[PDB]
Amino acid sequence: KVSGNYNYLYRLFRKSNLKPFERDISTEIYQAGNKPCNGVAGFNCYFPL
Amino acid sequence: IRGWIFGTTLDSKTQSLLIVNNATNVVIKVCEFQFCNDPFLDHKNNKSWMESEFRVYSSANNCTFEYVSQPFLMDLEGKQGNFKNLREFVFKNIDGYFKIYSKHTPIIVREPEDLPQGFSALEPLVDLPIGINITRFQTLLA
Ligand SMILES: *[C@@H]1O[C@H](CO)[C@@H](O)[C@H](O)[C@H]1NC(C)=O
């Protein structure tokens, strides 16, 4: 779509592999750096999608 | 003993699996179930049990898989002792497939528990393409 087709998504923050043939719905915000974030849209707290 | 629930967190943030034989048909639902902290179908009138609290999942949200098959043969009413029925199941999750194998043997009597010495193989019952990962399972009862 020339006007913007954002309906297709992908995941890039898991830090874990996958076995064959499964889907995973991890809506929760991934935390990196071993410091409890406990917030939304913070530094080193990125949305997984 | 009627059904089972399978998951990894079981708090409406991960994909969950439920299997129930209590109903008129065998029902398998892979859904985003929000199980409340009281997974009971037994607390009823003073000596009887009914099919109450059929909404143990407080929320059934955006979710995918549903399946209905014919019921499995149980007994009737309630008895103390003389447990002729014996049921065996094995549940596996391999290569993205959920495999359930079943076996049922009637007419067993003995005063102690903890199974006899029997050589009984298990026939395959169902293979399902649920496509999730599971870490903890909890038995259901009525
Ligand atoms: C289900 O659809 C709603 C509608 O916007 C959305 O908010 C939610 O994230 C969806 N959930 C899943 C597991 O797809």
Give the B window 76-95 contacts with A, CB below 8 Å.
Answer: 95
For residues A47 and A30, give the distance between their C-alpha atoms in angstroms, rounded to a whole number: 7
For residues B39 and B20, give the distance between their C-alpha atoms in angstroms, rounded to a whole number: 12
Distance of CA B16 to the CA centre of its chain: 13
Residue A10, SS3? coil
Residue B30, SS3? strand
Task: Name the residue among A20, A22, A28 with its Cβ closest to that of B132.
Answer: A22
Q: Are A9 and A49 in contact (CB under 8 A)?
A: yes
Ligand 1 in contact with B62 (CB < 6 A)?
yes
For chain A, how many helices (H) and strands (E)?
0, 2
Neighbours of B3 (CB within 10 A): 21
Residue A25: list chain B partners with CB under 8 A: 14-15
Residue B30: list chain A partners with CB under 8 A: none
Query: Which CA distances in Å does B119 have to B67, B87, B88?
Result: 32, 14, 13
DSSP B24-47: SSEEEEEE-EEE-S---S---SSS
Ligand 1 in contact with A12 (CB < 6 A)?
no
- Whole-number Å distance, alpha carbon B59 to ligand 1 midpoint, is 13
Judged on CB neighbours under 10 Å (0-12, 13-18, 19+), B124 is exposed
CA dihedral A4, A8, A11, A17 (to 10 degrees): -150
Experimental structure resolution, Å: 3.6
Enumerate the β-bridge partners of residue B42: none
Ligand 1 in contact with B80 (CB < 6 A)?
no
Q: Are A24 and B130 in contact (CB under 8 A)?
A: no
Residue found by looking up tokens 């009281």 in the block = B38
Q: Are B138 and B4 in contact (CB under 8 A)?
A: yes
What's A2's DSSP letter?
A: T
Q: How far is A1 from chain B (nearest CA, A)?
A: 26
Q: Which tokens in the block code for residue A18?
A: 């996958």
Minimum Cα–Cα distance from A28: chain B residue: B13
For residue B15, the ligand 1 atom closest to its alpha carbon is 13
- Which of B75, B83, B20, B79 shows the shortest CA–CA distance to B53? B20
